[PDB]
Structure formats: C-alpha cells, structure tokens
Amino acid sequence: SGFRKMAFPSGKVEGCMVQVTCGTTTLNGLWLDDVVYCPRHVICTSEDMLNPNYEDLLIRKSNHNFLVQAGNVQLRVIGHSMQNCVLKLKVDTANPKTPKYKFVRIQPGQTFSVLACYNGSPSGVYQCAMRPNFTIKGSFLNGSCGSVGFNIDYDCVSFCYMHHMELPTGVHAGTDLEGNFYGPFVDRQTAQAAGTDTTITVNVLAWLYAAVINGDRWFLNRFTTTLNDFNLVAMKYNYEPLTQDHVDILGPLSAQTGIAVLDMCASLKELLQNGMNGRTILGSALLEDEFTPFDVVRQCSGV
Amino acid sequence: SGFRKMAFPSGKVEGCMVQVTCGTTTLNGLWLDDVVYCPRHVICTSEDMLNPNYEDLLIRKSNHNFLVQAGNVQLRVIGHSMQNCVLKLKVDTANPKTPKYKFVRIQPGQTFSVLACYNGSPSGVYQCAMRPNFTIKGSFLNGSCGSVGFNIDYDCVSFCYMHHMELPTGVHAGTDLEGNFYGPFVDRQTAQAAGTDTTITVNVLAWLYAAVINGDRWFLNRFTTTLNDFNLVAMKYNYEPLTQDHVDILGPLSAQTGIAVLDMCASLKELLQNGMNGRTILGSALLEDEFTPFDVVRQCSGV
Ligand SMILES: *[C@](O)(C(=O)NCc1ccccc1)[C@H](C[C@@H]1CCCNC1=O)NC(=O)[C@H](CC1CCCCC1)NC(=O)c1cc2ccccc2o1
Ligand SMILES: *[C@](O)(C(=O)NCc1ccccc1)[C@H](C[C@@H]1CCCNC1=O)NC(=O)[C@H](CC1CCCCC1)NC(=O)c1cc2ccccc2o1
C-alpha cells in the first residue's frame, strides 16, 4: 500500500542525454541511433530571439558549427536538418545505449516523467501531466532546454516532450520529439501566455479510486448522479467535461472497488460543493489530477 | 522556475537490481561488485515468520539454495553470510555496472529516492523522507522487499535504505544497507506499530524559502520571533523543535532571499495558528516537510 507521485525509472533516457553547443548557446540533446535531437533555437543568438527566421539562420550554418558532447567524448556532426521546431544532427557514431523507443504526441490529461538535465547531465526525475491548456507545471532552470518527457512500456521508451521555454506564469511549454509545439506557442519571444486551465476530471476520479484501494473512504456517499448533472457541476467548478469514453476507461477501477463510476462522480460532486472540511485524501488537502486511470492501476496493483 | 518533488535519476541503481530466490520466497537484491545484498528474511518460510531464529535458518542453507538472477543471466552464489538483518551473497561475477557507491545511515528528516522494484525489475522512482518516527510513507506492494533508497552526489550513489515490511498504518519500515533497522522494528511478525510522528520543522522552513524563491510570498509578515517562542508554538502543533544547527543550515537560503530565519519562523507561526485560508503554497494546501534545505538549494538554483 501507499500512493506516491511516481516517475518511470530514468536509466534508459539517461544513456541518451548529450550536450549541444552552437556559438555561445548550449543546451541538451537526445542521442538515439546516429541522430541527436535538440531544440532548433540552439542556433539563435541573443539578437535573434525576437523574430527569428530559422530557415535563414540554419542555411548559414555548417556541420562544424555544432559541438555535440556525450560524456567526455566528442561526437562529430556529419549532417543537419530541421523538422518543425527540432534540429536533427546526424553524427558519425550510433549511440550504443539506444533503448527500444518511439516518438508519441500525447493528448492533454496524459502524464509523463521528465528527466531534468543541464549540460547533458541528468539532474532529477519527476512526474507531471500535460495540462488541458497545453502547458506543463515543471521545474526547469536556465540550461534545461532539450530535457525530455517520456513514458516506458515494457522496455520501450515513448518520448513525448522536449523542453523549450518558460511562460510568464512560471509554467512550461515545449514540443513533441518531432518538433511540434503542444498548444499555440511559438519559439520566439512574444506576448504569448498560458490560456485558462481546467482540472482533469477523469484523473481526479482515478485518484479517488486509488484512495479507496488504499483505505481512504471518508468521502464516499450513498448517492449517485447522472453524467449530465455531474457535468453541470463540473462546468461550474472549471473541471473538464467527463465523457462516456472516460467512464469506460474508469471501468476496471470501478470493477475492482465495487464503486460505480457515476457513484464516484456523486462523491466528487459533494467534494466540489462542500470542500474537504480539514480532511485529507492520500495525504493531499486538494483534489489531485495528475494521475491517469492507467497510472493508478499500474501503481496500486502492479509491477 | 517551478518546484517539484524530484527524485534522483535512477540509472546507476537500476544497473544493480537483481532477483533473489530461496525456496518459494523471491525478492529483490542489490548487486555491487561481487556481492548481492538482500533482506535476510528471504530465507524464511510461511511457518517461520512468527519468531524466526535466523542463525538457525541460515546454518541450514548452502550456496546452492540461493538463485540470483540478473536480467536473463543466472549468477552463481559462491559464499553467503549474515550482517544484522541483511544477507550478503558472494557471487562469482562482479557487476560490470557497479557505480561509485557508499553505504550511509541517515538521520530522521533526511530525504532520499526510492527505486521500487519487483522480481529484480525497476517499476518506478519517487522521493520521500525518513520520518521522525523512523518509518517512511512509501508505495510498496508484495514483492518490493529489497528495493533500495539512495541519494546521488557527483556520480557517487549513497545507499541508505533497504525495504523490509509494511506496518498496520500502511507506512513502511526497513534497514540501512548494513541491515540495521531504522527505529525499533524487528524482522518478525509482532504487534509492532509506528510511534507518534511529528512534522519536520527545518524542512517546512526550507520549503517556505523555496516558495519565496519561486514567487509565492503571500504568507510573509513583518514580524519576527525568538527561537524559544517559536519552539513553544511548534511543540503545540506537533512540530519538531528547531535548533540553532537548523538555523545555521538554513543560512544560505536566508541569505539568498533576504529573509532572516527567525522572520520565516514568524511566518510559519502565523500559518500554524491561522491556517492557509483557502490559499496554496507551491501548489499545496498543506505545509510540506519532505524537502531538506539542501534539496531546495539543489533544485532552485542548481544543476
Ligand atoms: C532554454 O532555452 C535553455 O535552457 N537554454 C540554455 C540556456 C543556458 C543559460 C541561460 C539561458 C539558456 C530556456 C529554458 C528556460 C529558461 C528560463 C528558466 N526556465 C526555462 O525553462 N528557454 C528560454 O530561455 C526561452 C528562449 C526562447 C529563445 C527563442 C526561441 C524560443 C525560446 N525563453 C524563455 O523561456 C523566456 C522567459 C522569459 C521572460 C521574459 C522575457 C523573455 C523570456 O524568455
Ligand atoms: C516483502 O517481504 C516482500 O516483498 N516479499 C516478497 C513477496 C512476494 C509475494 C508475496 C509476499 C512477499 C514484503 C513487503 C510488504 C508486503 C505487503 C505489502 N507492502 C510491503 O511492503 N514484506 C512482508 O511481507 C513482511 C514480511 C515479514 C516476514 C518476516 C520478517 C519480517 C518481514 N510482512 C509485512 O509487511 C506484513 C504486513 C502485515 C499485516 C498483517 C499481518 C502480517 C503482516 O506482515
């Protein structure tokens, strides 16, 4: 028993982190087979961030303008190209530590582990969710660009995020590993800001099931609700609408606890309306939305 | 910016996890150089857990009663011994992936990363604190025994915990890597229970400094306190007494934020007395005590 915000073991990703330098700009890159992936703004100077034309900047570079360092070993760059907002540097050596991997573009509400890295060196690992507003509430300092987010499934690393920037509210924005931003953001300095966010309802319900699995039951009630009356109150509290697909996703947790999904929705309605009255759930005094139904199942009854 | 419950990258420890089997009992072991470390209760049957005499049980075993599996490879056991509550199995092959490492016995209030593992296979990584009552609030299922806790410091892994059991409140107990339990617990089935716990005051103060570094300031006030009046209210709220050594430890964070330690104590006093009144600090509606001063410094201004 017990329930923690657990990240995936990070070793498979650690073996892929490298340092990329162009001019005076250094950031992290991801070295898979004979390719190194990094944010294209490594080719930017201080003068170019306002409105850069990356096609222009890149055509003015050659392979030798890119210094890739993997541990102590320098990797020679033998080709370079741009794909959306990521630069791909072909190197003359395939990473011997390449895991089985794929690139995935995730949906909002999905979770993933971030390996924070500086100068190609991993610093820490933590779990987070893609917010409905396409930002992530990370922990990133100067030099963290190029750090990646990922899930692991039976020894296959699915990479889903590459870090690019910090927004004025202190939340973070970035791309999939094919260089497409999550949300409306662009890699230039503009007035862009996070839109209004919402709470990930299906995840809150998953976490309430985790609490029951772990013996917190105080928030249950004898009531039920219809999906539409529930979605009425969710709209009121800035929660995402719950779909029938969400209900189907929550089926296994419902079956394991004997608590119908719409009954758990009646508990969530009561918690939204009444607060928690000085009590906690799984050691939190707030409703937690960073655990998917799959996260709960993995952690509570699996290995 | 941003502040997350961040664990150490786990790769150096992943390369050391193995599976140990004795009879019908299987758990995790830690393979460093030519030694595998695991809980001695791997030699226990279902009939022996009440009051086992481990010297007896062990003298009745030979090297061939222990099956050690590292990935797909079987490791041959060539010696065995007991050290407190850990078994040491000398194997004929030194782990090629052994990191620079040491064994440390930590003090209550110190934090560390746990690599949860099942059948020698890492499942997840998370951060936690040794509680004042010498238990940890982990996330552990059947098969997790032998999973370890650790810190990393410049490529040296300091191992400080090995998992052994779950107490009736759902919290966890275990040993250092030399097999000495944290707290009064023993490796047998008895009425043992966690004692009353307290909140780790110096850590709460560290985390309030993290909040200031990150722009949460709403809880500050113009007041100061003396150490003794503060410790009076801390005693009242089941907080650990704050020492001058704690104050000295918090010095660098004080210096970086310009907030004297005793002034931050006056803020904590006000928060204890008044609650948070529907507000949050670093995304929490409770006062967080699982971050040491060193954790804050590492995460907020370092790599
Ligand atoms: C990222 O580029 C990075 O880590 N670069 C390496 C580095 C090393 C030393 C100093 C700076 C950068 C960086 C990650 C940011 C940094 C700030 C703290 N947390 C983060 O996640 N990303 C940026 O600095 C981006 C750079 C833009 C350049 C043009 C292409 C798009 C990205 N900028 C910002 O994050 C940012 C925040 C902010 C606030 C006010 C004015 C400008 C501004 O930029
Ligand atoms: C740990 O031994 C383990 O993982 N063993 C491998 C394994 C594989 C399959 C089934 C069981 C064990 C295990 C870790 C526990 C398990 C329960 C959930 N969370 C955990 O952390 N540890 C135990 O099972 C210990 C065993 C004792 C045997 C004698 C030496 C001291 C340890 N027991 C308990 O944790 C425990 C909890 C509990 C509650 C009621 C009655 C007995 C009881 O034992």
CATH classification at residue B86: 2.40.10.10
CA distance B215 to B221: 15
The residue among A78, A77, A61, A102 whose CA lies nearest residue A18 is: A77
Residues B140, B5, single domain; the answer is: yes
Is the distance from the beta carbon of residue B143 to the nearest atom of ligand 2 less than 6 Å? Answer: yes
Resolution attained, angstroms: 1.6
User: Are A202 and A250 contacting, i.e. CB atoms less than 8 angstroms apart?
Assistant: yes
> Per the structure block, which two tokens stand in for B164?
């052994």
Instruction: Using the 3D structure, point to which of B45, B80, B99 is the last residue of a domain.
Output: B99
CB atoms within 10 A of CB B249: 18
Q: Find the helix packing angle between B201-213 and B261-274, rounded to 10°.
A: 100
CB within 8 Å of B56: residues ≥ 6 apart:
none
Three-state DSSP class for B227? helix
Alpha helices (H) along chain B: 11-14, 54-59, 201-213, 227-236, 244-249, 251-257, 261-274, 293-301
Strand partners, B82: B87
- Locate A209 and state its tokens: 């099931």
**Residues B209 and B295 placed together within one structural domain of the fold:** yes
User: B194: Cβ below 6 Å to ligand 2?
Assistant: no
In this structure, what token pair is assigned to residue B190? 């008895």
Residues 6+ away with beta carbon under 8 Å from A114:
A7, A125, A126, A127, A128, A136, A138, A147, A148, A149, A161, A163
Q: Closest Cα partner for B99 from B145, B17, B32, B147? A: B32
Distance B163 CA to ligand 2 centre (A): 10
The answer, for B139 touching chain A at a CB cutoff of 8 Å, is: yes
Q: Of B2, B12, B6, B1, give the one whose Cα is nearest residue B158.
A: B12
**Are A33 and A89 within 8 A, CB to CB?**
no
The residue among A194, A188, A211 whose CA lies nearest residue A133 is A194
Chain A residues close to B299, C-beta within 8 Å: 124, 139
- A203 and A297: one domain? yes
Alpha-carbon A199 to chain mean position? 15
Burial profile B188-202: b = 16 or more Cβ within 10 angstroms, e = fewer: beeeeebeebbbbbb
Choice among B16, B22, B41, B265 that is catalytic: B41
How many CB atoms within 10 Å of residue A134?
Answer: 18
Q: Given the DSSP bridges, would you call strands B148-153 and B121-129 parallel, antiparallel or unpaired? A: unpaired
Q: What is the C-alpha separation between B239 and A123, in angstroms, rounded?
A: 31
Both structure tokens of B207: 């985390």
Is residue A153 domain-shared with residue A92, that is, in the same domain?
Answer: no
Residue finishing a domain among A45, A74, A99: A99
- Cα B32 from chain centre: 20
Question: How many folded domains does chain B comprise?
Answer: 3
B14-17, long-range: CB < 8 A, 24+ apart: B14/A9, B14/A11, B14/B115, B14/B122, B15/A11, B15/B95, B15/B97, B15/B98, B15/B99, B16/B95, B16/B97, B16/B98, B16/B99, B17/B115, B17/B117, B17/B120, B17/B121, B17/B122
User: In chain A, which residue's Cα lies nearest the Cα of B119?
Assistant: A303
**Cα–Cα dist B226/B237, whole Å:** 17
In this structure, are residues A272 and A208 in contact, taking their beta carbons and an 8 Å threshold?
no
CA distances from B220 to A106, B19, B266, B289 (A): 39, 51, 8, 18
Residue that has been written with the tokens 């055509």 in this structure: A59
C-alpha–C-alpha distance, residues B246 and B294, integer Å: 12
Task: Tell me the C-alpha distance between B246 and B265, whole Å.
Answer: 12
H/E stretch holding A153 reads strand A148-153
Report d(CA A2, CA B146) in Å as an integer: 17
* Residue A164 near residue A149, CB atoms below 8 Å: no
Residues A266 and A223: their CA atoms lie apart, in Å, by 6
What is the distance in A from the centroid of ligand 2 to the CA of B21? 15
Same domain, B8 and B156: yes
Nearest to A175 by CA among A101, A82, A52, A94: A82
How close A79 gets to chain B, by Cα (Å)?
A: 30
Segment holding A165, helix H or strand E: strand A156-166
Chains A, B: CB pairs < 8 Å: 135
Q: Is A278 left (phi over 0), alpha (psi -120 to 50) or beta?
A: left
One domain for residues A286 and A250 = yes
C-alpha A268/C-alpha A284 separation (Å) is 15
End-to-end CA distance of chain A: 13
State the nearest Cα–Cα gap between A60 and chain B, in angstroms. Answer: 32
Q: Tell which residue, B122, B121, B120, B112, has the closest CA to residue B172.
A: B112
A84 touches chain B (CB under 8 A): no
Are A58 and A150 part of one and the same domain? Answer: no
Collapsing DSSP to helix, strand or coil, B245 comes out as helix
Same domain, A90 and A23: yes
Alpha-carbon distance of A274 to B94, in angstroms, equals 59
Judge: A1–B166 Cβ closer than 8 Å, yes or no: yes
Residue from A182, A191, A260, A180 nearest A224 by CA: A260
How far apart (Å, rounded) are the C-alpha atoms in residues A238 and A242? 12
Which tokens go with A113?
Answer: 């582990």
B143 with B269, same domain: the answer is no
The CA distance from B108 to A17, in Å, is 34
SS3 A282: coil
B163 is catalytic: no
Contacts of B156 (CB under 8 A, 6+ apart): B99, B100, B101, B102
Single-letter residue type at A121? S
Structure tokens at B206: 């560290």
> How far apart are alpha carbons B67 and B63 in whole angstroms?
9
Q: Which of B165, B167, B172 to mutate to test the pocket of ligand 2 (most atoms within 8 A of CB)?
A: B165
Q: Which helix (H) or strand (E) holds A91?
A: strand A86-91
Active site residue B22: no
Q: What is the CA radius of gyration of chain B?
A: 22
CA-proximal residue: ligand 1, atom 36 (nearest) = A166
Q: What angle do CA A187, A193, A194 make, to 5 degrees?
A: 110
Locus of tokens 């306190």: B225
HSE toward the beta carbon, residue A248, CA cutoff 13 A: 3
Q: How far is CA A65 from the centre of its chain?
A: 31
Q: How far apart are CA B300 and CA B282, in angstroms?
A: 13
Strand B35-39 relative to strand B25-32: parallel, antiparallel, unpaired? antiparallel
Task: Using alpha carbons only, give the angle A27, A32, A33 rounded to the nearest 5 degrees.
Answer: 135
Identify whether residues A94 and A155 lie together within a single domain: no
H helices of A29-155, in order, are 54-59
**Looking at the structure, do residues A22 and A62 belong to the same domain, yes or no?**
yes
CA distance B303 to B9: 12
Could you tell me where the DSSP H helices lie in chain A? 11-14, 54-59, 201-213, 227-236, 244-249, 251-257, 261-274, 293-301
Determine the Cα–Cα distance for residues A215 and A209; give it in Å rounded to an integer.
10
Q: How far is residue A13's CA from residue A92's CA, in Å, rounded to a whole number?
A: 20
Q: Which domain holds residue A141?
A: 1-14+100-197
Burial (CB count <10 Å: 0-12, 13-18, 19+), residue B85 = buried
Amino acid occupying residue A173: A
Q: Is B283 left (phi over 0), alpha (psi -120 to 50) or beta?
A: left
- The CA-based dihedral angle spanning residues B28, B166, B171, B169, taken in that order and rounded to the nearest 10 degrees: 160
Question: Where in chain B does DSSP place strands (E)?
Answer: 17-22, 25-32, 35-39, 66-70, 73-75, 77-83, 86-91, 100-103, 111-118, 121-129, 148-153, 156-166, 172-175
All residues at 6 or more sequence positions from A142 whose CB lies less than 8 Å from its CB, including other chains? none
Give the technique used to solve this structure: X-ray
CA dihedral A240, A244, A249, A253 (to 10 degrees): 90
Q: Which residue has the tokens 């089926």?
A: A251
Sort B303 into a burial class: Cβ within 10 Å, 0-12 / 13-18 / 19+: middle
Task: Tell me phi and psi for residue B138, to 5 degrees.
Answer: -100, -165
Residue A240: DSSP 8-state: P
Asked if residue A66 lies in contact with residue A23, where contact means CB atoms within 8 angstroms, the answer is no
Closest to A288 measured CA to CA, from A171, A232, A205, A215: A205
Instruction: Tell me whether A138 touches chain B (CB under 8 Å).
Output: yes
Residues B216 and B289 in one domain: yes
The C-alpha angle with vertex B7 and arms to B4 and B11, in degrees rounded to 5, equals: 140
CA of B294 to the centre of ligand 1 (A): 25
Question: Which domain-ending residue is among B35, B66, B99?
Answer: B99
Which candidate, B303, B173, B164, B113, places its Cα nearest to that of A6? B113
Q: Label the pairing between strands A156-166 and A100-103.
A: parallel
What is d(CA B145, CA B120) in angstroms, rounded to the nearest whole number?
A: 10
Ligand 2 center–CA B172 separation, angstroms: 10
Q: State how far Cα A299 lies from the chain centre.
A: 18
**Cα(A13)–Cα(A98) distance, rounded to whole angstroms?**
9
Largest CA distance in chain A: 69
